Protein backbone atom coordinates (compact mmCIF):
# COMPACT_ATOMS: atom_id res chain seq x y z
CA UNK A 1 0.00 0.00 0.00
CA UNK A 2 2.46 2.64 1.28
CA UNK A 3 -0.44 5.12 1.37
CA UNK A 4 -1.61 4.13 4.88
CA UNK A 5 1.04 6.29 6.55
CA UNK A 6 3.26 9.33 6.15
CA UNK A 7 6.02 8.61 3.64
CA UNK A 8 9.63 9.54 3.04
CA UNK A 9 9.24 8.79 -0.67
CA UNK A 10 5.73 8.70 -2.22
CA UNK A 11 7.11 8.14 -5.75
CA UNK A 12 9.52 5.49 -7.01
CA UNK A 13 12.99 6.33 -8.29
CA UNK A 14 11.75 6.31 -11.89
CA UNK A 15 8.72 8.51 -10.95
CA UNK A 16 10.99 11.11 -9.26
CA UNK A 17 13.33 11.09 -12.30
CA UNK A 18 10.38 11.57 -14.70
CA UNK A 19 9.20 14.49 -12.54
CA UNK A 20 12.69 16.00 -12.52
CA UNK A 21 13.42 15.64 -16.23
CA UNK A 22 10.02 17.11 -17.10
CA UNK A 23 10.78 20.11 -14.88
CA UNK A 24 14.23 20.54 -16.45
CA UNK A 25 12.96 20.26 -20.03
CA UNK A 26 10.18 22.79 -19.40
CA UNK A 27 12.73 25.18 -17.89
CA UNK A 28 15.10 24.75 -20.84
CA UNK A 29 12.27 25.23 -23.35
CA UNK A 30 10.92 28.35 -21.59
CA UNK A 31 14.10 30.14 -20.43
CA UNK A 32 15.85 32.68 -22.65
CA UNK A 33 18.45 34.18 -20.29
CA UNK A 34 20.38 30.92 -19.95
CA UNK A 35 21.23 31.22 -23.67
CA UNK A 36 22.84 34.67 -23.32
CA UNK A 37 24.27 34.44 -19.78
CA UNK A 38 27.19 32.45 -18.39
CA UNK A 39 26.41 30.29 -15.36
CA UNK A 40 28.66 30.45 -12.30
CA UNK A 41 28.08 26.72 -11.82
CA UNK A 42 25.68 24.98 -9.45
CA UNK A 43 27.03 26.30 -6.16
CA UNK A 44 24.83 24.18 -3.89
CA UNK A 45 21.79 24.67 -1.67
CA UNK A 46 24.03 25.61 1.26
CA UNK A 47 25.27 28.76 -0.48
CA UNK A 48 23.19 31.77 0.54
CA UNK A 49 25.26 34.87 -0.33
CA UNK A 50 27.65 35.56 -3.21
CA UNK A 51 30.00 38.47 -3.99
CA UNK A 52 28.55 40.94 -6.48
CA UNK A 53 31.96 42.45 -7.35
CA UNK A 54 35.44 41.35 -8.40
CA UNK A 55 38.28 40.95 -5.92
CA UNK A 56 40.80 43.77 -6.41
CA UNK A 57 43.24 43.25 -3.55
CA UNK A 58 44.08 45.74 -0.78
CA UNK A 59 52.53 47.44 10.59
CA UNK A 60 53.85 49.87 13.22
CA UNK A 61 53.44 48.31 16.69
CA UNK A 62 49.78 47.69 15.82
CA UNK A 63 47.96 44.90 14.02
CA UNK A 64 46.05 45.68 10.83
CA UNK A 65 42.38 44.87 10.25
CA UNK A 66 41.58 43.75 6.69
CA UNK A 67 37.96 43.72 5.50
CA UNK A 68 36.91 42.70 2.00
CA UNK A 69 35.86 45.64 -0.15
CA UNK A 70 33.63 43.36 -2.24
CA UNK A 71 29.89 43.73 -1.74
CA UNK A 72 27.79 40.63 -1.08
CA UNK A 73 24.21 39.87 -2.06
CA UNK A 74 21.88 37.06 -1.02
CA UNK A 75 20.60 34.59 -3.61
CA UNK A 76 16.82 34.76 -4.19
CA UNK A 77 14.63 31.66 -4.40
CA UNK A 78 11.73 31.37 -6.85
CA UNK A 79 9.22 28.60 -6.15
CA UNK A 80 5.79 27.36 -7.21
CA UNK A 81 3.60 24.79 -5.45
CA UNK A 82 1.45 22.02 -6.91
CA UNK A 83 -0.45 19.02 -5.56
CA UNK A 84 -0.74 15.32 -6.43
CA UNK A 85 -3.65 13.10 -5.43
CA UNK A 86 -2.77 9.91 -3.57
CA UNK A 87 -5.20 7.75 -5.55
CA UNK A 88 -3.51 8.87 -8.77
CA UNK A 89 -0.13 7.84 -7.35
CA UNK A 90 -1.58 4.49 -6.30
CA UNK A 91 -2.94 4.13 -9.83
CA UNK A 92 0.49 4.82 -11.34
CA UNK A 93 2.16 1.92 -9.36
CA UNK A 94 -0.54 -0.85 -9.09
CA UNK A 95 -1.95 -0.36 -12.65
CA UNK A 96 1.64 0.20 -13.93
CA UNK A 97 0.38 3.27 -15.84
CA UNK A 98 2.44 6.45 -16.43
CA UNK A 99 2.02 9.35 -13.96
CA UNK A 100 0.59 12.71 -15.12
CA UNK A 101 3.07 15.53 -14.46
CA UNK A 102 1.04 18.37 -15.98
CA UNK A 103 0.91 20.26 -12.68
CA UNK A 104 4.70 20.02 -12.38
CA UNK A 105 5.11 21.26 -15.96
CA UNK A 106 2.85 24.24 -15.27
CA UNK A 107 4.68 25.09 -12.05
CA UNK A 108 8.03 24.88 -13.84
CA UNK A 109 6.76 27.15 -16.63
CA UNK A 110 5.56 29.75 -14.11
CA UNK A 111 8.85 29.61 -12.20
CA UNK A 112 10.82 29.99 -15.45
CA UNK A 113 8.71 33.02 -16.40
CA UNK A 114 9.47 34.54 -12.99
CA UNK A 115 13.19 33.84 -13.44
CA UNK A 116 13.28 35.70 -16.76
CA UNK A 117 11.28 38.58 -15.28
CA UNK A 118 13.80 38.86 -12.43
CA UNK A 119 16.74 38.66 -14.85
CA UNK A 120 15.52 41.39 -17.21
CA UNK A 121 14.04 43.65 -14.51
CA UNK A 122 15.12 43.72 -10.89
CA UNK A 123 12.93 44.40 -7.87
CA UNK A 124 13.99 47.91 -6.71
CA UNK A 125 12.91 47.06 -3.15
CA UNK A 126 15.19 44.07 -2.42
CA UNK A 127 18.22 45.66 -4.11
CA UNK A 128 18.26 43.46 -7.23
CA UNK A 129 18.97 45.03 -10.62
CA UNK A 130 18.20 43.81 -14.12
CA UNK A 131 19.55 44.19 -17.63
CA UNK A 132 16.98 46.92 -18.40
CA UNK A 133 17.28 48.78 -15.07
CA UNK A 134 21.02 48.76 -14.31
CA UNK A 135 22.80 52.04 -13.58
CA UNK A 136 25.51 52.82 -16.13
CA UNK A 137 23.93 51.00 -19.06
CA UNK A 138 24.37 52.61 -22.50
CA UNK A 139 21.03 53.76 -23.95
CA UNK A 140 20.54 54.57 -27.67
CA UNK A 141 17.53 56.47 -29.12
CA UNK A 142 15.14 54.12 -30.89
CA UNK A 143 14.45 54.30 -34.61
CA UNK A 144 11.51 53.62 -36.90
CA UNK A 145 11.48 49.83 -37.26
CA UNK A 146 8.74 49.87 -39.92
CA UNK A 147 11.19 51.16 -42.53
CA UNK A 148 13.37 48.45 -44.13
CA UNK A 149 16.62 48.41 -42.18
CA UNK A 150 15.59 50.60 -39.25
CA UNK A 151 16.18 47.80 -36.76
CA UNK A 152 19.50 47.01 -38.44
CA UNK A 153 20.60 50.65 -38.14
CA UNK A 154 19.51 50.76 -34.49
CA UNK A 155 21.57 47.65 -33.76
CA UNK A 156 24.55 49.14 -35.64
CA UNK A 157 24.36 52.32 -33.56
CA UNK A 158 24.01 50.28 -30.36
CA UNK A 159 27.00 48.12 -31.34
CA UNK A 160 29.16 51.15 -32.17
CA UNK A 161 28.40 52.93 -28.90
CA UNK A 162 28.92 49.71 -26.93
CA UNK A 163 32.24 49.39 -28.77
CA UNK A 164 33.31 52.93 -27.82
CA UNK A 165 33.94 51.81 -24.22
CA UNK A 166 36.04 48.72 -24.94
CA UNK A 167 33.25 46.14 -25.05
CA UNK A 168 33.15 44.20 -28.33
CA UNK A 169 33.04 40.40 -28.39
CA UNK A 170 30.18 38.20 -29.59
CA UNK A 171 27.00 40.31 -29.18
CA UNK A 172 23.62 39.02 -28.00
CA UNK A 173 20.36 40.81 -28.82
CA UNK A 174 17.07 40.22 -26.98
CA UNK A 175 13.94 41.92 -28.30
CA UNK A 176 10.38 42.37 -27.08
CA UNK A 177 7.55 40.62 -28.96
CA UNK A 178 6.36 43.93 -30.42
CA UNK A 179 9.82 44.54 -31.91
CA UNK A 180 10.19 40.91 -33.00
CA UNK A 181 6.86 41.07 -34.87
CA UNK A 182 8.25 43.87 -37.07
CA UNK A 183 10.94 41.83 -38.89
CA UNK A 184 8.51 40.67 -41.61
CA UNK A 185 10.48 42.16 -44.53
CA UNK A 186 12.07 38.73 -45.07
CA UNK A 187 15.33 37.31 -43.78
CA UNK A 188 16.06 40.56 -41.96
CA UNK A 189 16.69 38.67 -38.71
CA UNK A 190 19.52 36.79 -40.45
CA UNK A 191 21.32 40.04 -41.33
CA UNK A 192 21.21 41.03 -37.65
CA UNK A 193 22.45 37.61 -36.51
CA UNK A 194 25.60 38.35 -38.55
CA UNK A 195 26.30 41.28 -36.22
CA UNK A 196 25.09 39.35 -33.13
CA UNK A 197 27.13 36.15 -33.17
CA UNK A 198 25.66 34.86 -29.90
CA UNK A 199 22.12 35.24 -31.26
CA UNK A 200 18.97 37.33 -31.61
CA UNK A 201 16.20 36.14 -29.30
CA UNK A 202 12.65 37.07 -28.35
CA UNK A 203 11.66 37.68 -24.73
CA UNK A 204 8.05 38.05 -23.61
CA UNK A 205 9.06 39.66 -20.30
CA UNK A 206 10.30 42.78 -22.11
CA UNK A 207 7.60 45.46 -22.02
CA UNK A 208 6.66 47.95 -24.71
CA UNK A 209 8.90 48.83 -27.65
CA UNK A 210 12.17 47.82 -26.00
CA UNK A 211 15.20 45.64 -26.68
CA UNK A 212 18.67 45.00 -25.30
CA UNK A 213 22.14 44.27 -26.70
CA UNK A 214 24.72 42.75 -24.35
CA UNK A 215 28.45 42.11 -24.72
CA UNK A 216 28.59 38.55 -23.42
CA UNK A 217 31.38 37.19 -21.25
CA UNK A 218 32.02 36.04 -17.69
CA UNK A 219 34.00 39.23 -17.02
CA UNK A 220 30.91 41.36 -17.76
CA UNK A 221 27.94 39.45 -16.33
CA UNK A 222 27.18 36.06 -14.77
CA UNK A 223 24.19 34.10 -13.51
CA UNK A 224 25.08 32.55 -10.15
CA UNK A 225 22.84 29.50 -9.72
CA UNK A 226 22.96 28.24 -6.14
CA UNK A 227 20.69 25.34 -7.12
CA UNK A 228 19.04 24.44 -10.41
CA UNK A 229 15.29 24.16 -10.86
CA UNK A 230 14.12 21.02 -9.05
CA UNK A 231 10.98 19.53 -7.46
CA UNK A 232 10.82 18.78 -3.74
CA UNK A 233 8.26 17.11 -1.46
CA UNK A 234 6.71 19.46 1.11
CA UNK A 235 5.32 16.58 3.24
CA UNK A 236 1.92 14.82 3.08
CA UNK A 237 -1.09 17.01 3.90
CA UNK A 238 -4.40 15.21 4.31
CA UNK A 239 -3.47 12.02 2.45
CA UNK A 240 -2.55 14.26 -0.55
CA UNK A 241 1.02 15.07 -1.64
CA UNK A 242 2.22 18.68 -2.15
CA UNK A 243 5.36 19.37 -4.16
CA UNK A 244 7.31 22.54 -4.90
CA UNK A 245 9.35 23.47 -7.98
CA UNK A 246 12.11 25.75 -6.73
CA UNK A 247 15.27 27.41 -8.05
CA UNK A 248 17.79 29.69 -6.33
CA UNK A 249 19.71 32.09 -8.55
CA UNK A 250 21.03 35.63 -8.87
CA UNK A 251 22.20 37.87 -11.72
CA UNK A 252 25.60 39.55 -11.31
CA UNK A 253 26.35 42.58 -13.50
CA UNK A 254 30.02 43.49 -13.03
CA UNK A 255 30.37 45.82 -16.05
CA UNK A 256 27.07 47.73 -16.31
CA UNK A 257 28.33 49.58 -19.41
CA UNK A 258 28.38 46.33 -21.42
CA UNK A 259 24.56 46.57 -21.68
CA UNK A 260 22.80 48.75 -24.26
CA UNK A 261 19.02 49.15 -24.19
CA UNK A 262 16.95 50.45 -27.10
CB closer to a second copy, 142 vs 255: 255
CB of 257 to a second copy, least distance (A): 14
Q: Is the dihedral of CA 123, 127, 131, 133 positive or negative?
A: positive
CB closer to a second copy, 220 vs 261: 220
CB of 137 to a second copy, least distance (A): 19
CB closer to a second copy, 110 vs 142: 110
CB of 129 to a second copy, least distance (A): 14
Provide the pairing of β-strand 171-175 with 199-202: parallel
CB closer to a second copy, 41 vs 136: 41
* Separation between Cα atoms, residue 194 and residue 184, nearest integer Å: 18
CB closer to a second copy, 46 vs 141: 46
CB of 119 to a second copy, least distance (A): 12
E strand or H helix at 225: strand 221-233
* Residue 239 neighbours by CB under 8 Å, 6+ apart: 3, 86
* Separation between Cα atoms, residue 81 and residue 53, nearest integer Å: 33
Question: CA 148, 153, 159: angle at the middle one, nearest 5?
Answer: 150
Report which DSSP code applies to 96. Answer: T
* Separation between Cα atoms, residue 140 and residue 203, nearest integer Å: 19
CB of 150 to a second copy, least distance (A): 11
CB closer to a second copy, 72 vs 144: 72
CB of 139 to a second copy, least distance (A): 20
* Dihedral, CA of residue 231, residue 246, residue 41 and residue 174, to nearest 10: 120
Amino acid sequence: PDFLGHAENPLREEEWARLNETVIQVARRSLVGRRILDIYGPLGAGVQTVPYDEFQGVEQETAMVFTDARKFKTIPIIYKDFLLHWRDIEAARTHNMPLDVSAAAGAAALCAQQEDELIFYGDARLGYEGLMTANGRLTVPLGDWTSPGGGFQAIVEATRKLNEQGHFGPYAVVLSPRLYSQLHRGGEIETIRQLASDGVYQSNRLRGESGVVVSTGRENMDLAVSMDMVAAYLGASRMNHPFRVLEALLLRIKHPDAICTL
